[PDB]
């Protein structure tokens, strides 16, 4: 539960800033390689609107989710952008991330619990624009002179996704 030091906070901020640049420039192979561990659990669960008096538990990885991939299945998603002949994405849509509110915590065993807000802006073709807001929850560990995410939970704000798809990495 102990917050990280200012010097450690910079490196985690700088890690996400580098990570954002690789997403926008389209360097997913190079991201999957450095900044992602082989025991990754990329998870974006489906939160349904319930009453507050409803006593059911929050969605688990076993339940329905937009993303629920391991490294191998996450790699399969990455190769579609590279090797694929996707007609929607010639040319690639311009995406731009806005990471903010980054707060790291020491989780023991050289692992860091990180919470942050993410505002994704997407533009494609002539006049099409879509905006998404997410709440990221990560577990980063120190691997060499850098970081690698092994647990990643993305909480979408909107119930109904006002967009053609959610095919973008965070």
């Amino acid at each position: 539960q102990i917050p990280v030091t200012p010097d450690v906070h910079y490196d985690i901020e700088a890690h996400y800033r580098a990570e954002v640049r690789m997403f926008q420039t389209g360097q997913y192979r190079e991201w999957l390689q450095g900044m992602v561990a082989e025991d990754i659990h990329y998870w974006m669960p489906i939160y349904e609107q319930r009453l507050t008096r409803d006593r059911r538990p929050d969605p688990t990885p076993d339940d329905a989710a937009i993303y629920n991939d391991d490294f191998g299945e996450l790699k399969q998603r990455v190769e579609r952008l590279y090797s694929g002949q996707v007609w929607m994405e010639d040319p690639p849509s311009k995406i731009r991330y806005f990471v903010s509110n980054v707060e790291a915590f020491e989780a023991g065993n050289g692992e860091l619990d990180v919470l942050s807000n993410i505002l994704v802006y997407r533009n494609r073709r002539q006049t099409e624009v879509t905006v998404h807001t997410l709440g990221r929850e990560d577990k980063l560990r120190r691997d060499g002179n850098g970081f690698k995410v092994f647990r990643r939970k993305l909480i979408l704000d909107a119930r109904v996704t006002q967009d053609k798809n959610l095919y973008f990495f965070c």
Partner: protein, 449 residues
């Protein structure tokens, strides 16, 4: 002419025109049976789900007596929405405005200060929420607004022959898994409808990226090669009431890489299906489907995705994506099929993400006046179709064909032209007169073998 069943063509006004949408809402969505959900979404007594009947919000609830009832999600007092929750368990629904308590069937059970302010003069029986006719078929719960309509059995009709193959199977049957993936797609509701009913033709071109990496059986489709025979590799179907589907042989576990539980399930149950429904329907049981139930429910058996297109005007829809799975399948297998179905045909699906523009572009291109006055072509497989001796309804020779397209827009035209069900029911004998080649499969099967 909006639709031409003889020449197999439709005007571009069908996707764009707002007055045509007015006719669709009146003579299709307020007439035919629409997919509400499944009994697995509301398993225990008291369980409910809010859902759409087109643009009408409705609350499907599992009753205390055991039945399934549905009603319009709107209070009889000032019109306010009664329940906003997607799902849960409730013996009574309370409105957030004043507190009018509604029953499990939408009946006005109680109102605050009834003796004080109303003086018990409020006729609560006349202030019930607009109830909707609910009927179940193999667990799948449908909804209808027209009392003069036929039964859900008759509405499916000869399509029950096919549905029984998978929705009953080896005694287990199938069920939907939630919560669904809701998302807005700026397109007409018929473009995904016609796509998922019989568009094997776009699979090779549009999804050439995903099919190449996955490999297996469906990798050969990528690039639209002319060498592979599609007539022998699949078939297509269409029925009286606009229900139809394409089928690819021996590709049930096609897109699934992790298919061990799903593949073993088919190999264990195919023997029972061959006994129950014969070897003709076992062929389908082992194959990949692309079905649409008229008007706005679609699903892919094998890939196991289940979609419902809720129209929100002529140029927009809300796509609800469930995951259809067998009941008798293991909990681990159900979870495996769910992950693979969402990874392929979810909001961020590896395939579904390719179709995004294909649906929207076809609709919003008709913003131009000269464009929307033009027409669309659906003549792929004209002449090579007719009544099969074994299979009911009309059947096409290949899954890459537009027999389902023609049959969809033919029943659409009939519904749009007819003032009531009585006029539709009058054409039970002469519905497939637009399919001229009667002795097609008789000559084809005699030529073969």
């Amino acid at each position: 002419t909006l639709v031409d069943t003889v020449n197999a063509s439709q005007s571009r006004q069908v996707f764009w025109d707002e007055d045509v949408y007015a006719l669709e809402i009146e003579r299709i969505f307020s007439r035919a049976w629409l997919m509400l959900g499944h009994e697995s979404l509301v398993p225990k007594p008291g369980d409910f789900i809010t859902t759409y009947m087109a643009e009408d919000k409705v609350i499907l609830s599992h009753q205390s007596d055991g039945t399934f009832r549905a009603f319009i999600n709107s209070c009889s007092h000032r019109g306010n929405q009664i329940c906003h929750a997607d799902s849960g368990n409730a013996k009574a629904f309370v409105c957030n405005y004043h507190g009018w308590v509604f029953g499990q069937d939408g009946s006005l059970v109680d109102v605050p200060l009834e003796s004080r302010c109303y003086h018990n003069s409020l006729d609560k029986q006349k202030l019930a929420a607009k109830s909707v006719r609910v009927e179940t078929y193999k667990g799948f719960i449908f909804g209808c607004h027209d009392p003069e309509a036929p039964s859900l059995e008759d509405y499916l009709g000869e399509f029950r022959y096919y549905l029984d193959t998978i929705w009953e199977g080896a005694g287990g049957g199938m069920e939907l898994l939630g919560p669904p993936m809701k998302s807005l797609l700026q397109c007409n509701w018929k473009v995904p409808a016609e796509n998922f009913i019989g568009d094997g033709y776009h699979v090779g071109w549009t999804h050439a990226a995903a099919l190449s990496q996955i490999g297996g059986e469906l990798a050969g489709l990528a690039g639209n090669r002319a060498d592979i025979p599609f007539d022998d590799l699949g078939l297509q179907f269409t029925t009286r009431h606009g229900h139809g589907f394409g089928v690819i042989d021996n590709a049930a576990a096609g897109l699934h890489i992790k298919r061990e539980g799903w593949t073993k399930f088919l190999e264990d149950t195919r023997g029972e299906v061959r006994r129950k429904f014969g070897p003709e329907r076992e062929r389908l049981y082992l194959g990949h489907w692309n079905c649409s139930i008229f008007p706005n429910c679609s699903f892919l058996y094998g890939t196991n995705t289940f979609k419902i297109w809720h129209p929100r005007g002529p140029h927009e829809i809300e796509v609800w994506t469930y995951t259809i799975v067998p009941r008798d399948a293991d909990p681990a297998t159900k979870s495996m099929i769910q992950r693979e179905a969402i990874r392929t045909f979810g909001t961020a699906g590896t395939l579904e993400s390719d179709d995004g523009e294909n649906m929207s572009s076809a609709t919003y291109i008709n913003r131009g006046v000269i464009t929307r006055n033009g027409r669309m072509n659906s003549t792929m497989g004209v002449g090579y179709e007719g009544p099969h001796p074994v299979y009911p309804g009309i059947v096409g020779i290949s899954f890459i064909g537009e027999t389902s397209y023609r049959g969809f827009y033919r029943f659409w035209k009939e519904m749009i032209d007819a003032p009531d069900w009585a006029s539709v029911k009058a054409n039970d004998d002469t519905w497939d007169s637009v399919f001229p080649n009667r002795n097609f499969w008789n000559e084809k099967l005699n030529a073969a073998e």
